[PDB]
Design an enzyme around this catalytic site. Structure first.
Site, PDB file in Angstrom:
ATOM      1  N   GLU A  69       7.495  18.702   1.463  1.00 24.31           N
ATOM      2  CA  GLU A  69       7.956  17.210   1.578  1.00 24.31           C
ATOM      3  C   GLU A  69       9.720  16.956   1.570  1.00 24.31           C
ATOM      4  O   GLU A  69      10.370  16.516   2.346  1.00 24.31           O
ATOM      5  CB  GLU A  69       7.416  16.295   1.022  1.00 24.31           C
ATOM      6  CG  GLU A  69       7.445  14.729   0.818  1.00 24.31           C
ATOM      7  CD  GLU A  69       7.747  14.086  -0.422  1.00 24.31           C
ATOM      8  OE1 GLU A  69       8.512  13.532  -0.858  1.00 24.31           O
ATOM      9  OE2 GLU A  69       6.651  14.434  -0.994  1.00 24.31           O
ATOM     10  N   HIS A 298     -15.523  -7.728 -13.370  1.00 23.00           N
ATOM     11  CA  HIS A 298     -15.312  -9.179 -13.660  1.00 23.00           C
ATOM     12  C   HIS A 298     -14.687  -9.650 -14.892  1.00 23.00           C
ATOM     13  O   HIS A 298     -15.066  -8.944 -15.993  1.00 23.00           O
ATOM     14  CB  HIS A 298     -16.617 -10.007 -13.114  1.00 23.00           C
ATOM     15  CG  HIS A 298     -16.412 -11.434 -12.493  1.00 23.00           C
ATOM     16  ND1 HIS A 298     -16.076 -12.510 -13.107  1.00 23.00           N
ATOM     17  CD2 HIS A 298     -16.268 -11.482 -11.386  1.00 23.00           C
ATOM     18  CE1 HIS A 298     -15.959 -13.483 -12.346  1.00 23.00           C
ATOM     19  NE2 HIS A 298     -16.054 -12.821 -11.303  1.00 23.00           N
ATOM     20  N   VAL A 318     -10.800  -2.189 -16.690  1.00 26.08           N
ATOM     21  CA  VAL A 318     -10.685  -2.179 -15.276  1.00 26.08           C
ATOM     22  C   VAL A 318     -11.953  -1.474 -14.922  1.00 26.08           C
ATOM     23  O   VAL A 318     -12.433  -0.260 -15.563  1.00 26.08           O
ATOM     24  CB  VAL A 318      -9.668  -1.148 -14.721  1.00 26.08           C
ATOM     25  CG1 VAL A 318      -9.588  -0.554 -13.342  1.00 26.08           C
ATOM     26  CG2 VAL A 318      -8.340  -1.736 -15.194  1.00 26.08           C
ATOM     27  N   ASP A 853      19.576  -9.506   6.201  1.00 22.61           N
ATOM     28  CA  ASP A 853      17.977  -9.206   6.530  1.00 22.61           C
ATOM     29  C   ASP A 853      17.167 -10.363   5.913  1.00 22.61           C
ATOM     30  O   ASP A 853      16.989 -10.731   4.855  1.00 22.61           O
ATOM     31  CB  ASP A 853      17.772  -7.709   5.636  1.00 22.61           C
ATOM     32  CG  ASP A 853      16.288  -7.484   5.842  1.00 22.61           C
ATOM     33  OD1 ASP A 853      15.733  -8.116   7.291  1.00 22.61           O
ATOM     34  OD2 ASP A 853      15.697  -6.483   5.387  1.00 22.61           O
ATOM     35  N   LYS A 854      16.694 -11.133   6.890  1.00 17.71           N
ATOM     36  CA  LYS A 854      15.537 -12.244   6.419  1.00 17.71           C
ATOM     37  C   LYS A 854      14.452 -11.885   5.922  1.00 17.71           C
ATOM     38  O   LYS A 854      13.801 -10.994   6.129  1.00 17.71           O
ATOM     39  CB  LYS A 854      15.446 -13.037   7.857  1.00 17.71           C
ATOM     40  CG  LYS A 854      16.869 -13.234   8.818  1.00 17.71           C
ATOM     41  CD  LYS A 854      16.490 -14.284   9.945  1.00 17.71           C
ATOM     42  CE  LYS A 854      15.020 -13.763  10.905  1.00 17.71           C
ATOM     43  NZ  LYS A 854      15.244 -12.521  11.574  1.00 17.71           N
TER      44      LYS A 854
HETATM   45 ZN    ZN Z   1       9.142  14.595  -4.932  1.00 15.74          ZN
END
Ligand code: ZN
Length: 961
Positions: A69, A298, A318, A853-854
């Site tokens: 990557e 909940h 959680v 940029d809007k």
């Molecule tokens: Zn990385």
């Protein structure tokens, strides 16, 4: 009719609010594609998601897909320059990133809308002919090593990897995804591996068109976007790779009924409960795992959390389904732990199983499903318009999971009530399938195991069969009831007609001793939502460390007290944010406008009449203490920023001052503080959204009247509206402040070149310079010089003053870091002299697009106005004004600005450096192929923050517009 396309999809179901146009298709080579046309968009965007990630790493080269990557950005056959991609984006108002999960590698960018094709062409080459250049590989390995370094001492990341370490070691789940220098360079050398070839092998093996989805968004028509995507992507080769699958769970027999006792870095107390479950993904039309998540997690009356909190054992919970990969998932229930809670883990888990038993006793509830289904339908209909880059990234990823026609709706719209699946999943949440992890400092010294990759100290025990039994015989607890109908569910969605005297910017519609009301009816987005922002001023929130502590505790106790009631509002898309500030209090209420007045009133009413539960006070105080202490475990660069805030602001209490003063906070003392705080206020508000002027004035007066009625609030004098100033540094001065980080073994540095007060001219000078240096800085200091993962530059704005800042986290010492930044500054000046007139104009153009940029959604536009209001500059038309002026600037202006304010021999250089030293560094000096670093002056070492501040002038405050 087109050999390149396997098929065009049917209509892509969208919200009727959504003006964007969509086309799904699958290429001949198997790439699934979603095209998005928005002829109004300022930035265009694309993203590609390969359905391969870490789980597919060769067992002998941990982190290779993550390394791949990183490597893809660094040059292709068609575009060999290591930084051609990033440089092109930079010059055209764009940005880019990527992530690697277990089963995905996701790459994305945005760019000025005029330059989609240029961007996308460069982008496509990542997936066709990457170079994996030999010299880039050697260098880039350090960035990844640095990425991992910062994660090492992080409790989340440690728990993340520890779970993986304690399942089946044979399972791909147990792999180490990040990689580091050891796994990516050192070990592979020792083993005769040419990683460049391994990267080539891997890319060639898995980067098959059949495992790819692409999403593109631009101004072009759907047809033009089609040709484009065909032209650039149909040449990716289909290598027919089987989609990896993991049908066997990483937690087998012997991985169940296990307890784990774990030592954290921070002083935290957490209980993690985990059940192995099947992959529920395919059941997306009913989400049975979310049904149970919604119930078990909940927070309303009758809930699991409620009792656990009443018994004073936990504060937060959680619960719900957690992702695994194709073939396995987890169900979790996690809570923090009070001191008492740490000695009652067994009872907590019993209560957990009691609640689950209640769900069995009741059976699945169609009305609960129906309610979620309706809420989700509304959420989807009125969803805020996303920023392109997040959107394309998200869609690229989910194209792998749903039919083309369903990509937009699949995560929102429920279709099937499935009592069968609900019970099937519920049947897996049993003590014989449980895993329990306790994280506490109390296990310090009592552990016998070390996790390889992080060094996590833990111990493992079988859960006693008698304890399992006790849990298995859990009967019903009268304290646990299902939630009842959700009264906060909005029903009124009418968009109010756009009023006659409506304005493009917020208007000051009330200017009294008690309150300033800024107002704007929505003229852009037309969703039934609003933002109600309030700023409460009191000198008593920050008069001294004690009061700061008290402001915090008050508001935390308020929120804890309201939590139960407010939970339903949040499920119904009505939330609030409430915190203490250096000026008093900040309250924001956002969401569907229908029921906001109700929530707001309950808030203000509660704060004006608050009564504190002592049990809650003690628990919250204790957690706040740990919270302060835990700052010592934040990252060096974060410490660096902290110390600069402290040095440059007129008034600021240190975390040390706050905690020392915390023992003096008693229940009597707090009870006394609250009426004190509330007795004199000024309020400045922005009400913005689907509301009328009369509604806005009405809401503002309601807030005031509630305070007047219950707290006797009177106005604050105009002169008591104190803004803090920034320290004014001497021309040609340089100060260094130095500390040690006792947790992390890295350094941090922040270098601040203070310039002058904010103004049209001073702003744009600084901003143009940052634009020009932005990617060269990343490229030089990270890519080439590989100083660290964290390399940052850009404007610093505070108290109406500004300057240039650099932030780096490195294994190299700050004095070294310092000279490299200085070296870089000189490179930049030559660079600026060397660049063409057009190259200059391109940077003006790029900043111009960035600034113009809007906002795509109500809260974003609101946020821009709020910045104007809280800064007291009230410059709502700033963007047009500042851009107009930007376009006036010449190369020469920037050179002069640099020579006068920034250069090493600049007449008006105002420099501060914060050095944060690594754990293992004792002392360290403050001064000392590669470019030339200039000789530096002797700095004045700041010995004491107070004296430093006392010995310098303070700047004026900025004048309102
Ligand atoms: Zn990385």
């Amino acid at each position: 009719n087109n050999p390149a396309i396997k098929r065009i999809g049917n209509h892509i179901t969208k919200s009727p609010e959504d003006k964007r146009e969509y086309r799904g298709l699958e290429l001949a080579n198997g790439i699934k594609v979603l095209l998005i046309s928005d002829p109004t968009t300022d930035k265009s965007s694309a993203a590609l998601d390969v359905h391969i990630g870490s789980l597919s790493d060769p067992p002998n080269i941990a982190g290779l897909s993550h390394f791949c990557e990183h490597m893809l950005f660094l040059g292709t056959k068609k575009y060999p320059k290591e930084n051609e991609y990033s440089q092109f984006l930079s010059e055209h108002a764009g940005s880019s990133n990527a992530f690697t999960s277990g089963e995905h590698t996701n790459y994305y960018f945005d760019v000025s809308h005029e330059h989609l094709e240029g961007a996308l062409d460069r982008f496509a080459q990542f997936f066709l002919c990457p170079l994996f250049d030999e010299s880039c590989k050697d260098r880039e390995v350090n960035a990844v090593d640095s990425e991992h370094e910062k994660n090492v001492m992080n409790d989340a990341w440690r728990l993340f990897q520890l779970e993986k370490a304690t399942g089946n070691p044979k399972h791909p789940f147990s792999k180490f995804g990040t990689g580091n220098k050891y796994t990516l360079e050192t070990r592979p050398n020792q083993e005769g591996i040419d990683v460049r070839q391994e990267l080539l092998k891997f890319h060639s093996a898995y980067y098959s068109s059949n495992l790819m989805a692409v999403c593109v968004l631009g101004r072009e028509s759907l047809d033009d976007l089609t040709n484009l995507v065909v032209k650039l992507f149909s040449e990716v080769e289909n290598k027919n790779v089987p989609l990896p699958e993991f049908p066997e769970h990483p937690f087998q027999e012997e991985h169940l009924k296990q307890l784990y006792k774990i030592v954290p870095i921070k002083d935290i107390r957490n209980l993690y409960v985990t059940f192995p479950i099947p992959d529920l993904q395919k059941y997306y039309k009913s989400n049975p795992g979310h049904y149970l998540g919604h119930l078990i997690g909940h927070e309303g009356p009758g809930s699991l959390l409620s009792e656990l909190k009443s018994k004073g054992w936990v504060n937060t919970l959680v619960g719900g389904q957690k992702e695994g990969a194709r073939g396995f998932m987890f169900f979790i229930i996690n809570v923090d732990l009070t001191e008492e809670g740490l000695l009652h883990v067994e009872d907590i888990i019993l209560h957990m199983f009691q609640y689950i038993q209640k769900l069995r006793a009741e059976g699945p509830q169609e009305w609960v499903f129906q309610e979620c289904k309706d809420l989700n339908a509304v959420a989807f209909r009125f969803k805020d318009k996303e920023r392109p880059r997040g959107y394309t990234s998200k869609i690229a990823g989910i194209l792998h999971y749903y039919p083309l026609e369903e990509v937009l709706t699949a995560e929102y719209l429920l279709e099937e009530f499935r009592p069968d699946l609900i019970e099937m999943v519920l049947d897996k949440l049993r003590p014989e399938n449980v895993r329990v992890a306790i994280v506490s400092k109390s296990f310090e010294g009592k552990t016998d195991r070390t996790e390889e990759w992080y060094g996590t100290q833990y111990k493992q025990e079988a859960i006693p069969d008698e304890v399992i039994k006790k849990w298995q015989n859990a009967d019903l607890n009268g304290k646990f009831k299902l939630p009842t109908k959700n009264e906060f569910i909005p029903t009124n969605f009418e968009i109010l007609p756009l009023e006659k005297e409506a304005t493009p910017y917020p208007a000051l519609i009330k200017d009294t001793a008690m309150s300033k009301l800024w107002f704007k009816q929505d003229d852009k987005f037309f969703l039934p939502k609003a933002c109600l922002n309030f700023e409460f001023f009191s000198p008593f929130a920050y008069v001294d460390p004690l009061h700061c502590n008290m402001a915090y505790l008050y508001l935390e106790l308020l929120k804890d007290s309201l939590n139960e009631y407010a939970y339903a509002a949040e499920l119904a898309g009505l939330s609030y944010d409430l915190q203490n500030t250096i000026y008093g209090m900040y309250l924001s209420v956002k969401g569907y406008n229908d029921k906001q007045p109700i929530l707001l009133k309950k808030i203000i009413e509660k704060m004006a009449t608050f009564e504190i539960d002592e049990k809650r006070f003690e628990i919250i105080k204790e957690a706040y203490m740990r919270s302060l202490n835990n700052f010592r475990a934040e990252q060096p660069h974060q410490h660096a920023m902290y110390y600069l805030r402290l040095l440059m602001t007129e008034v600021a209490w240190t975390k040390d001052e706050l905690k020392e003063a915390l023992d003096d906070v008693t229940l009597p003392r707090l009870k006394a503080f609250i009426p004190q705080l509330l007795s004199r206020l000024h309020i400045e508000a922005l009400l913005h959204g689907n509301i009328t002027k009369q509604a806005a004035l009405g809401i503002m007066q309601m807030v005031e009247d509630t305070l007047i009625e219950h707290a006797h609030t009177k106005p604050l004098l105009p002169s008591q509206l104190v803004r803090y100033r920034e320290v004014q540094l001497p021309d040609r001065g340089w100060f260094v402040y130095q500390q040690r980080n006792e947790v992390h073994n890295n350094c941090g540095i922040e270098i601040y070149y203070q310039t002058d007060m904010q103004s049209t001219s001073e702003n744009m000078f600084l901003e143009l310079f940052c634009q020009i240096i932005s990617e060269p800085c990343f490229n030089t200091l990270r890519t080439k010089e590989q100083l660290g993962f964290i390399v940052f530059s850009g404007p610093r704005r505070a108290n109406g003053i500004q300057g240039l800042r650099f932030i780096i986290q490195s294994e190299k010492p700050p004095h070294y870091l310092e000279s490299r930044v200085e070296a870089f500054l000189i490179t930049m000046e030559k660079s600026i002299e060397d660049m063409t007139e057009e190259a200059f104009q391109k940077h003006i153009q790029a900043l111009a697009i960035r600034r113009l940029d809007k906002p795509k959604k109500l809260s974003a536009e609101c946020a821009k106005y709020w910045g104007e209001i809280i800064s007291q500059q009230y410059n709502f038309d700033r963007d047009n004004t500042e851009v107009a002026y930007l376009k006036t600037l010449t190369k020469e202006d920037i050179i002069k600005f640099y020579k006068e304010m920034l250069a090493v021999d600049a007449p008006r250089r105002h420099k501060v450096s914060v050095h944060v030293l690594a754990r293992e560094m004792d002392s360290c000096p403050v001064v000392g192929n590669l470019s030339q670093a200039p000789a530096l002056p002797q700095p004045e070492v700041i010995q004491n923050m107070t004296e430093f501040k006392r010995g310098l002038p303070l700047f004026p405050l900025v004048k309102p517009h």
